[PDB]
Structures are given as C-alpha cells and as structure tokens.
Amino acid sequence: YGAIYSVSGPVVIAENMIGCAMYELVKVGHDNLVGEVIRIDGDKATIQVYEETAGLTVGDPVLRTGKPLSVELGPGLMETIYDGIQRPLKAIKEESQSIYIPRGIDTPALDRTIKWQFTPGKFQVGDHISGGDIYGSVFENSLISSHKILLPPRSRGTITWIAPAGEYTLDEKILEVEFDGKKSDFTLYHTWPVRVPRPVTEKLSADYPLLTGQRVLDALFPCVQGGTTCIPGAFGCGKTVISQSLSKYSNSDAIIYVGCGERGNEMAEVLMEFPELYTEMSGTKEPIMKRTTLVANTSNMPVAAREASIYTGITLAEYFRDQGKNVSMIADSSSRWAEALREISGRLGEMPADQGFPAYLGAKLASFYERAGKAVALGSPDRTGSVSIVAAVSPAGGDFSDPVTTATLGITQVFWGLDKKLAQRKHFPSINTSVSYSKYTNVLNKFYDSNYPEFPVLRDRMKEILSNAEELEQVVQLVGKSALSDSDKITLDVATLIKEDFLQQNGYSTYDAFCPIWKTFDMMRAFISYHDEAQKAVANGANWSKLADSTGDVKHAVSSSKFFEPSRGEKEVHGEFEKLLSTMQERFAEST
Amino acid sequence: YGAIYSVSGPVVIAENMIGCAMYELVKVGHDNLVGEVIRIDGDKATIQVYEETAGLTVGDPVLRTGKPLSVELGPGLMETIYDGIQRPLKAIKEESQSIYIPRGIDTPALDRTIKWQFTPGKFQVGDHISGGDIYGSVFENSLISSHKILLPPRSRGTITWIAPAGEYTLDEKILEVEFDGKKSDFTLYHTWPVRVPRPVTEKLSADYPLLTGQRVLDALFPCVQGGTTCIPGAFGCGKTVISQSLSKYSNSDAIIYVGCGERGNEMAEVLMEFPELYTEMSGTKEPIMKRTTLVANTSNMPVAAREASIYTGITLAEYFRDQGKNVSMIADSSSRWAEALREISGRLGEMPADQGFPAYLGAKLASFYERAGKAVALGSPDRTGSVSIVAAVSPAGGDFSDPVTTATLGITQVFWGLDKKLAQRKHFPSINTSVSYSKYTNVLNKFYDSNYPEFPVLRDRMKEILSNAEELEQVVQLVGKSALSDSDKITLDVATLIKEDFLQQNGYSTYDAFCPIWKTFDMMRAFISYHDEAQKAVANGANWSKLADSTGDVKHAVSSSKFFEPSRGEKEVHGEFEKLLSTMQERFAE
Amino acid sequence: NREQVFPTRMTLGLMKTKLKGANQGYSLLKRKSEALTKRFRDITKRIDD
Amino acid sequence: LTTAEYLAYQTERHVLTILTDMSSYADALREVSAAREEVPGRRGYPGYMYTDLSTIYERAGRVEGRNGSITQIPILTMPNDDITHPIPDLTGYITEGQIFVDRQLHNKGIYPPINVLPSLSRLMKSAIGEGMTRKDHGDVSNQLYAKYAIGKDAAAMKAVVGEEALSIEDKLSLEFLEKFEKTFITQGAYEDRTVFESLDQAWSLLRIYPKEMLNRISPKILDEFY
Amino acid sequence: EQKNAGGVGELEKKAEAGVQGELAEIKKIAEKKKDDVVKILIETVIKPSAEVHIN
Ligand SMILES: Nc1ncnc2c1ncn2[C@@H]1O[C@H](COP(=O)(O)OP(=O)(O)OP(=O)(O)O)[C@@H](O)[C@H]1O
Ligand SMILES: Nc1ncnc2c1ncn2[C@@H]1O[C@H](COP(=O)(O)OP(=O)(O)O)[C@@H](O)[C@H]1O
Ligand SMILES: [Mg+2]
Ligand SMILES: [Mg+2]
DSSP states (O other), rough: OEEEEETTEEEEEEEEETTOOOOEEEETTTTTTTEEEEEEOOTTTEEEEEEEOOTTTTTTTEEEEEEEOOEESSSSSSEEEEEEOOOHHHHHHHHHHSSOOOOOOOSSSSEEEEOOEEEEEOOOTOEEEOOOOOOEEOOOSSHHHHOEEEOOOOOOEEEEEESSSSSSSSOOEEEEETTEEEEEEEEEEEEESSSSSSOOOOOHHHOOOOOSSSSHHHHHHHOOOTTTTTTOOOOOHHHHHHHHHHHOSOOOEEEEEEEEEEOOHHHHHHHTTTTTOOOOOGGEEEEGGGEEEEEEOOTTTTTTHHHHHHHHHHHHHHHHHHTTTTOOOOESHHHHHHHHHHHHHHTTTTOOTTTBBTHHHHHHHHHHHHTTOEEOOOOOOEEEEEEEEEEOOTTTTTTTTTHHHHHHHHHHHHHHOBBBHGGGOOHHHHHHHHTTEEETTTTTTHHHHHHHHHHHHHHHHHHHHHHHHHHHHHHHHOOOSSSSSSSHHHHHHEEEEEEEIIIOOTTTTTTTSSSOOOHHHHHHHHHHHHHHHHHHHHTOOOOOHHHHHHHHHHHHHHHHHGSSSGGHHHHHHHHHHHHHHHHHHHHHHHHH | OOEEESSSSEEEESSOOOSOOOEEEEEEEETTEEOEEEEOOOTTTEEEEEEEEOOOTTHHHHHHHEEESSSETTTTTTSSSOOOSSOOOOOOHHHHHSSOOOOOOOOOOOSSSOOEEEEEOSSTTOEEEEEEEEEEEEESSSEEEEOOEEOTTTTOOOEEEEOOSEEEEEOOOEEEOSSSOOOOESSOOOOTTTTTTOSSSSSSOOEEEOOSSSSHHHHHHHHHTTTTEEESSSSTTTTHHHHHHHHHOOOOOEEEOOOOOOOOOHHHHHHHHTTOOOOOOSOOOOOGHHHHHHHBBBBBHHHHHHHHHHHHHHHHHHHHTTTTOOOEEEEOOOHHHHHHHHHHHHHTTTOOOOOBBTHHHHHHHHHHHOSSOOOOOOOSOOOOEEEEEEEOOOOOOGTTSHHHHHHHHOOEEEEOOOOOOHHHTTTEEEEETTTTEEEHHHHHHHHHHHHHHHHHHHHHHHHHHHHHHHHHHHHHHHHHHTOOOOHHHHHHHHHHHHHHSSOOOOSSSSSTTTOOOHHHHHHHHHHHHHHHHHHHHHHHHHHHHHHHHHHHHHHHHHHTTTOOOOOGGHHHHHHHHHHHHHHHHHHHHO | OOOOOOHHHHHHHHHHHHHHHHOOOOOOHHHHHHHHHHHHHHHHHHHOO | OOOHHHIIIIIEEOOOOOOOOOOHHHHHHHHHHHHTTTTTTTGOTTTTTHHHHHHTTTTTTTOOOOOOOOOOHHHOOOTOOOOTTTTHHHHHHHSSSEOOOOOHHHTTTSSSOTTTOOOOETTTHSSSSSSTTTTTTOOOOOOOOHHHHHHHHHHHHHHHOOOGGGHHHHHHHHHHHHHHIIIIIOTTTTTTOOHHHHHHHHHHTTTTSTTTTTOSSSSHHHHHOO | OHHHHHHHHHHHHHHHHHHHHHHHHHHHHHHHHHHHEEEEEEEEHHHHOOOOOOO
C-alpha cells in the first residue's frame, strides 16, 4: 500500500511504491480506482487511472494488485456491455440504482450467480492437457451454443480430476491440473493480460471473404475474414453506420463491438436494435444480440480508459478466436484511442513527436492491428478461428494526412476511404472509389472462382468504368461536355447510374439494408451488361441520344434493381435478375 | 589527466579537468581517441570525440594535448586521402592492413619516410626572415614542381642556419631561426590551427575567371579565381557532377576536394577516375591526382569529423594559396556540414534557431567562406594566390528556403541554383536560369574586353532572350499560343534551341565533358547570329514557318556545334565555327 | 476543393506562382474575349448588311 | 548488415541485403529519442537520424581485395507519399539513388508502378557504358526520360488547356506516354526482361518520333540503331 | 502431371540418409576431441585472473 503524491489530470504519480511493476494494475484512492503504472521514478510510480480523478487527496492509499490489466475471459461475455475495463454496465446499474457510473465500482466482470450447463470434453482423468486445449463446453445461449471452455494459455499438466456434466457457476471448480507436483484448480473462466496477445499455434493466410452486406465494400474493396480494415472519414461520413451494418449482417460467428470516444447514443441504439434483428445462422432465427458483446467507453468517460477498452475488446475477440469462431472486432475510433494516448502523453511530459501524438503511437497501432488474423487455435482438438479488425479512424479536420490515419494506412490491408462530399448529399456509403483500396482482391480469387467466377472480372470492369468516368467528369467540369464522344457519353451515363443505384446503399431501407453477395454479383452483372449492350449498340451506329430515349425503360429497370428484397431468397431474386438481363438484351436489340 | 564523467554518445563529458580551453584536442579513453573541448562547465569539460565512442567507461583517462585542431601543412599532401581530421587513409590501410579504419589510430598526416628534394631559396644565413617568407622549393610532383617551404606565419627572426640543397625527409630540421633569443628549428612541414585563417598581406579583387568548363556556368554565371560559389539543390540535380567537373577540368593550379557528409563511393569514384584524366597545365600532360588533394570524410564518420573536414580542406587551400597557387577548393555537402553542426548542437542542448539548425550557423558559414579571395601572401618574395570555394549545398526537400541555403546565399557571390524538374528530365547541368546569378560579371568585364570582347554583350543578349522567352512561354501556357507573333515564335524557337543544345551538356560524354571558353564563346556567337538572322529575315517579310523549313539545315548545324569536339584545338574548332557563320550568313541571302 | 499538393515551402511558392499565372491568364483571356466580342458584333452587323 | 558484411567480405559472397520498413526503423529511433527527451529534429525525429541512417546504409559496397559485395535495397515506405519527409529525404541524400513507386501509377494499374522520373541511379553512368551493355544504353535512357517528361507536361497541358491546342509534338508525346506507361513500364511478375530486350522495346518506343526530333540521342547511335 | 508430382514429394529417405553420414562424422569428431576440448575448458574455468579494473 503506497500513497498518492501528485494528481494532475488522468495521471497520478503515487509515491512510496517501491516494487511496483510496469503496467501493473493498482487501486489509487480510497474508492479503489483502477489504474496502470506508466513510469517508475524511484519510489514514485506514475499511474494512469481509468476513472475520474476528481476528489483524490495527496496521501490516499494506493494498493498494488500485482497483476497487469487482465480481462476476465469465460462464459457469459457474449450478450453483455462493458465499460472498457470489463465492468458489466447492467450489473453496475442494478447495483447502484443510478443512471450514472459510480467511481470505484468493483463488480465482477462476469456474472457469478448464473449457473451454466457444463458438458465435459474428450479429455478425462490422466490425459496430459496443454495450454489452449478444450476440456469442456458450456451452453451459453441458443445462438452461441457450446461455449467451449479452454485451458488457460501457459497452463499445462496432467488432468487429476474433471467435473462431471451438470450445472456450474464460474466460481465453482471445474478442473484440477497437476504440473510438477503442484495442483492447479481451474474454473469456467480465466484471466488474461490484455497487453499480451493470446497465443495461437500458427496463423494462416485469410481466404474467406467477410461479407459486409454493403454493395461497394463487398464488391469493389472486399475484406477477408481475418484481415485489418481501416475506415477514415470526417464526421457524418458513415463509419459508425458501416461498422454497425457489418456487425449486424456479417458472416462472422461473433462480434466484438468496441466504442472508444463514440457517443453513448450509438451504444443505446445498438442495445435497442440488435435484439430486434435476427440472423439465419445456426439453422434458426436468433437475435443478433446473442452473439455480440459491446465494450462501451464513451467520449465523456475517463480518457485513459480508451486504451483499456481497445485492449479488452481485442482480447475478447482473441478468446472467441481461440474457441475456433470467426470473430470480427469493430473498434469505433482508433483515432479516439490515439487522442487518449496524446492526452496521457501530454499530461506526462513526453516529446510530442508529430501533431502531439506520442512517438510510440505507430508501434501501438501496429501491435493492435497485428493481433488480428486467421489462426489455428493453440491446443487440441484442432480448430481454426479468425479476428477481423475493422476500425474506423476519425481524422482531425477531415484530412487523411493525420498521423493516426497515416499509421493505420501503413499497417492495415483494406482502406475504405470516405469522402465528405458524398457524405453530404446523402450518398452513403460515401466511399471514395479513387483512393480506397483492398489488398485482399488477389487472395479472394480462390473464393470468387469457386462460387462466383465472374465476380473479379465484373469488379475490374466496374472499377475501370468508374476511373474513366472520373477522368471524363474532370475534363468536362472545366471544358464542358460539348465535345465528348458517344462512348464517353455512355461511360458517363453508366457510371452516374452506378453511383446513383449500385454504389449508394440505403442501409436503413428494407430493400437495401443488406445486399448479400449473390445479389451484389447479379446487380454488377446487370449494370455491366447494360454498359456493354449500350456500347455495342452505339458502335453498331445508333445515336446515343435516341438510344437513351428508347431504352429509358431498361435504364429504369436496371436502376430499380436495388429494390428487390433479398428476403425473397437467392432463387427468387436471381430469377427476376435473369429476366432483367433477358428483357434488357431484347430492349437493346429491338431499339437498335 | 582527467576522467570521463559522462558519454551519452559522441559528446563525452570529462571531469577533473582544470585549465582547459575551448576547441582543445584532448585524448579521450585508453585508445587515445581525439576530441575537442567545446564546453568547460567548471571542472567538467564537454568533449566532442572525432572517433566512435563505444566502450568508453566512466573513469578512463582524458589528457589535454595543448593545441587546437591543427593540420600538418607541408610537402607530402598532393595525392593522399585524408579523413575528417587529417589522417592518411592510404597510410592507415597500409599500416593496419584492414578494410576498416582502426579506432584511435595515430598515423602522421605526412609521410616521414619519403626523402624530399630540397633547394634553398634566395634567403641566406644571417638574413632577417619574416613569417610566410619562402626559404626553399621542394619538388613534389610533376605538376607541383616547386612546393615552396614557407616559414610558418607568426614566427619570425634572423636565420642562423639553413640546410644545403639535398634530399631531406619531413622530420629533418632545415632552418634555425634565432628569433628573440630562443633559437627555434623549422623542418619541412609546419602545423597550423584550422579555425584560424592563415594570414595574408592584403586580399585583392579576384579578376581572372575560374573556367568551370560547363557552358551554363562559364557563360551566363561565371566564377573568378578567388570567388565563392554555391550549388544548392535536392539529392540528384548534379551538384556532385558539377563539383567533379570543376575538379577535373579547371584553371586552378591546385585543388582540395572536401567530401564532408558524402558517400564513400563518391570518393571511390574520384580516386578511380582522377588518375585517368590528364591536363596540359605543365609542360606535359600529367595525372589529376598529382594536383588534387581529397579530404574525404564519408557520411558514416562522426559528425565532429564532418565539421572538421571543411576547415581542414579550407586551410590546406589557404596554404597552397600562400604558396602562390591559384587553388579552387570544392566543398561537398556544406548542408551536411550544417547538419553535423545541428546534431552537435542538439546533443549539447543548445536551443536551435532556424529549422533546427543552430543560431551560429550563419557565423560559421561566413567564417568559412571569407577564407576565400585572391590575396598576396605575406613575406618575400611576393606572389598571388587564390582560393575559389565551390561549395555544394543540399537543402532538405529541395526548397531554397532552408537556413543553410539562405545563409550561404547571403554570404557567397555566385549561385548555381539547380531545379529538380530539370534534373529529373535529365536536363543537366539543370541550372535554374531564372534564379541563378553571378556577381562577378562586373569584375570580369575587364578580362572579357582583354580576351573575348563580345562575350559580355552576347551573355546579356542570351539572358534577355531567355527571360523574354520564359515570359512568352508563360503567356503561351495561359492563352493556348493563339496567333503568336512571328518574332515571338522566333524567340521561343531560339530559346528552346539554346536550352536543348547549349545549356544541356552531358558532362560524361567525350565531346561535351569540357567546353572551353573559346568554344563556348563561338557557340554563343553562333546562336546569337542565328537568332539575329531569323529576326532580320522575318522583319524583312519572310514567314517564320517557311524560313524554318528552309533553314533547318543551319539549325541542325548549330545543334551539332555542341557535338563539335574541343580536342581538335582552337585553330580547328574556331575555323569550323567560321564556316557556320558563313553558312548562316548564306541563308540570310536566300 | 483543394489541389492534392504536399504541404511544403517549395509547394507553397509553386502554388503562389500558379495563382499569379491564373489571375494573369484570367485577365488576358477576358480582354481577348472582349476584343473578339467587339469583332463578332461588327461581323454580325456586316453579315446582316 | 553485419551478417551481410561477414558473408560478403570474410566469405567472399555476393549478398543482396533487403531491408524493409526503414520508416518503421526510423519510427523506433523517434520512440527512443522522444523517451530520452533529446532535442528533436524535423517531425520529432532525432537530430542524429541522418547519422544513424548513414551508418546503416553505408555498410554496402565493394571492397579492395575481397571478391564479394553487398547490394542494399532498403524498402522505404514514405509515410504520406511525400518525398520531403525527413526519412525519405535523408535516405535519398545518403543512398546512391532511389526507386520511386507512384500511387498515381498504381491507381492507373501499372505494375511495377515505378515512377521513373523521381527514381535515380547514381551508378548508372558508370554501369551503363559501352562494353558493359550496349553502346546505346545511356542515350536511350536520357531520350526516354526527356520524352516522358514532355509527355507529362503535355498531359498537364491537355488537362488544363483544350486538347486541340496541343501541337503535333505534344500529341506524339502523349502517345509516347501512353505506350511507355502501358507497354514499357507495365511488366507483370515473372516477366524477366533482359537488358537488351528492354533496350529493343525502348527503341520501338522511340521509333514513334522522327530521327530529327530525337535530340538526346547522339547522331552515331541514331544512325546505327534507328 | 499429377502422377509425376506425387512421386517428387515422397522422396525423403534419400535426403535423410544423405545427412546420416554427416551425423556420424560429427559424432566421430566429438568422440575424438572431447578429452582435449573439455580439458582446456576446465583449465580456463579453474584458472582465473585476479585483475582489477583498469580505471
Ligand atoms: N449506409 C447508410 N445508409 C443510410 N444512411 C446512412 C448510412 N451511413 C450513414 N448514414 C446517415 O448518415 C449519418 C452519419 O452518421 P455516422 O454515425 O455514420 O457518422 P460517423 O462518420 O461515424 O461520425 P463520428 O465520427 O462522429 O462517429 C447517419 O446517422 C445516417 O443518418
Ligand atoms: N552534367 C551532367 N552530365 C551527365 N550526367 C549528369 C550531369 N549532372 C548530373 N548527372 C547525373 O545525375 C546523377 C546524380 O547526380 P549527382 O551529382 O550524383 O547528384 P548529387 O549532387 O545529389 O550527388 C548521376 O548519375 C549523373 O549521371
Ligand atoms: Mg463513429
Ligand atoms: Mg553529392
């Protein structure tokens, strides 16, 4: 037990703490505020407390827990909301009877009263169990069934006794492992330091796509299950809506939605809407909320806790990855994590580096983004999981030259840039098709050739059409459109149609809330066939103005193809699309 | 005998050292690493070590040498390679027998084993000798046929004994000066601090030009023997190529090629290329390395050596000026000297002033550049020397707003600004004609009236043509070149021809490596005559399109004038241009 | 609504030169348009006659 | 690099050192420099970052007596695609050239997207002479550089002023840019163009122009190869 | 092509036997010079130097 020596903002230099470790978790103040040691200058030890510093007196005791900031992995995480340091907000509200979060609440990170059905695994007494091996599973909810119980990493030995099938709480003993003559008792849960990535046997090259549900993201700039993703853009661009839509309609088994610096109203919207929505996975209609946990650390919450929120979320994602699930972390603002880092650095006194962001910001972002990736789990039985980190960067001033944005672009593989010009005029997703890139298009050729062989060719054709139209619009905006060729006019019209109908997706409309991969492929086929038919008809000799006058009906049918509800199914929607191409081909031959 | 109290990198802080003086060389460490005391904070004394501080412990002895940074001026340095201090790289390689530089090696700056032929001067025993006077003439090389053994400045007296003509080494005493009672002894060589300018009787106004060989420089932006020039530009742009062009082909009788903050392969290329080339300055053609000294300090050597190499080169050039030789020192990466200064200031903790550079950057650059200029060396017999300082500056990012670029621009008299746009298009020498200037044209009017009377008028005419064509090209870019005047089109075509065949020369091609003053004057006259003929013929009434169609042959001849080989001599080349003027005049009649 | 130029002193000077040239071209082309408009009005009157 | 030095010199091998993310190395230096509270340079980078980068880079080259060599190709990623950043600036000032990868060319779809204009090789002058390669290497390289610069200027002129205002030379240079970027630079992986084949293709590019327009080509080479 | 490809990857016994001679040579060299190397290591460990720091 030390003492507080200096309190300046979210940092507390506590004296009389010889023996404190780096990033060692402490309890600053009489209310036992959660803090982590940053510097140790002699007996002094600077601490970044993860709570409100108002009211800390010089001389308050500071306890040394002895262990780093440790998330509490285990059953019960899946349908919950956390405060950044893994404090269940429901439990805080129920215990406090107040709409506020009291300073120093020490509620357990996981509900201890709830009894979980336990089904022992293939292991038994005498089997040599290794770190990360599955010695049982628990039924968490209807959607995430068999929440496999993993032996903690770096814990190894022979199984002395295993709990039989039944109902158990988290505090109850579940397993006893003997290592070098010392027995170790294991429960349903286990702690893990958030700073250190959870070990895996061997990471793998991600190849299965992450079906976002947005047309442009799923087609033009695809993302794989197990790859970092960056979403820069100013306020109102659509990063939060893109993230929420990805969490709602992704093919991932679980979601780790992390909000650092995001509004509390976004968290309220997610909590209100996710249970209403349902998924077709697992052979039944179950609420989305049953497979997504939220790490809520809003902007008015303590500054230092944003880093803890990021690390807690990524460690939960790593846990559900080691369970063999396809998880996708969604950090709401890596930029806000970096701004928290800048505030802590400025209060500490380190050198500002660039823009004031600390010099270690790039390394921290690189490590956090390297936590993600498809990997084989650590222990037997063999199972493969993946963590896809899709983090929305928030540049200052709406310019992609911010240090956070530059580091994120350097480290991530997929860059979904957002332009505020399209953020206005209600052109969501406001994806800037010129600067955005995806480096998984090469690896995704296997999946595309397996399922939709014409998908890469159609995507390339649409990309080159968009580039040609960008050049044409650039030249026209200064030199008018009185000298364009018929082919140029066709390109401009078809790309305007693509922007107005295909690329733009109203995520809050029933028809365009979720455009699946097959619908997106069919609509790309429709638009590309329209462009090709127009080009061929005009090259045959037909004037473009007369052709447009005659084929306005076909153009309207193509542009209204987004209204086809995917709820009808793949067979029904594809049946209408096949008739759309056949009618369009006929209406381009009769007109010509 | 002090002791290191702190190291913290290249700047050790030795304690228990009283009586220290600023810029005094101490011997840091057990390996006797040399240094230079740069802050004396009481007993402690911050020292910038010229070698790699790695292993120096707290408690190692530091001893004060009792002398500032001094070079070993004398015979024996006309083909050697020196480090940032003055350490013979060839001798180091031949002694340590290693491809690296041994840490703390102590090799004499001059070879004491070579026996130098000595011939005493007019001074005899009993005469009153003054500092800077000549009392011998050592035959060093074929090019340097008489290395005058100057009496050290600030050392005078009555000659008590002089050695007779014979073969002497660099350690055998040659002269005994009575002085004020204390009979000193003077050998062939003599040391001199590098940060103290060598004395001169009186500096003069440099008149004769330094023929760079490059047409752009030697025609539009001339330099004089004794002038200070700068060649600022981003990486590339041909700063090093221009430097080596003035190193190989120049009117200077000696040269010190300083390479502070330069790649080792640059010095390797100099060492591999210079022995091949020959000049006829002496009676017969002799290799370049017989008149070239390399103060080569690669970029990975300590920043203190980068700081020291500039001063070592400039004081060697001052010595060869004091001998009466027209020297043209070529400093490389003066911006890297400034970067070494900035790093040293940062390690010290002094507050940077402009873009991170130290506040005294301008003062240091002025002190270094002011060492130039034609001057009469003190002492008898009288003889005139010159130190042209052709220093290359490499501003960060290619912007001429850098503090080092601004200070050098304010201090120097000539500025051969280089453009990245012209460099990337391989339009070398890539001289930015709009910004480049020379303040020595007013002085050089006399030499031009003596040798080539029409040169100043032609240079002014070409500058006016280039400026008018730049304005016309801006207007063309603005207004689409709609209905351009015939004279305007003539000026545009002539200036494009000038830029593509007179301001563009491959310094590595055999024909255009060196364009002499006479050849560049003839080419200037040919271009101006072509422009005047076109102007007059169109003013008579001829259409410019038809005139160009008819005179394409003359235009191609003027273009091939750049391909004319200067190796044929003045008589052949001048006659060839006489035909070109005759052909150009013939087209005027048609 | 801004050129994609990396912020630098050289870039700033280049853009100031570009702005001066753009203003000069604007003035020159407006004056040329005025002259050609006078010539076009004269040509229209001559065409009617 | 000390492993490379050992192999190349003490073993007489021909090492091809490939450093990647030298920008990340410089970021590590900045992290260490910031922690030490030393006086910073541009963008917070240490004032001695030039010396550290020079120490790393200058460990490559051939040595007398030894029959081995080190050929460094440090993969430097400019942070904001700006060559004026301290890391690329000091790297280009220390090293013997640079290969410039262009975001604009990558957007155009050219691989390798090597923007030849900012790229430079200071040893090209001595390594591309007669005997080592064909006698036309230097002239062809200079002519291609000049015509590509003219092409970029003509593209800017076409973008700003009307296309009809472009001269015949401007149109030819636009065509040269199109075929240079879309046929000469575009190579694809595993292509393996020999130097002589690349020179022949470059000549095919230069045969668009009449022999009169090719200023950078010397007359002898122009007569021999055109 | 598939049939030829399968045979290439099965070839590992030849590679294993090729190194088998190297292991025998290493074991022979060790068995030969163990006495000398261990004895000189023992001499080095047993015989220290009472050397004070130079500074
Ligand atoms: N895909 C979409 N479909 C329909 N409307 C959208 C879509 N994306 C965004 N919008 C609209 O634009 C608004 C943008 O808000 P959003 O939460 O996406 O902002 P943001 O860029 O994440 O901002 P912040 O940086 O402040 O968190 C939404 O509230 C919604 O009204
Ligand atoms: N006058 C010139 N003639 C021919 N090539 C030149 C000339 N000037 C520069 N170059 C070319 O520029 C390249 C690099 O120029 P250099 O002088 O090394 O740049 P820096 O000044 O940055 O060292 C060289 O490979 C050289 O071929
Ligand atoms: Mg948001
Ligand atoms: Mg250089």
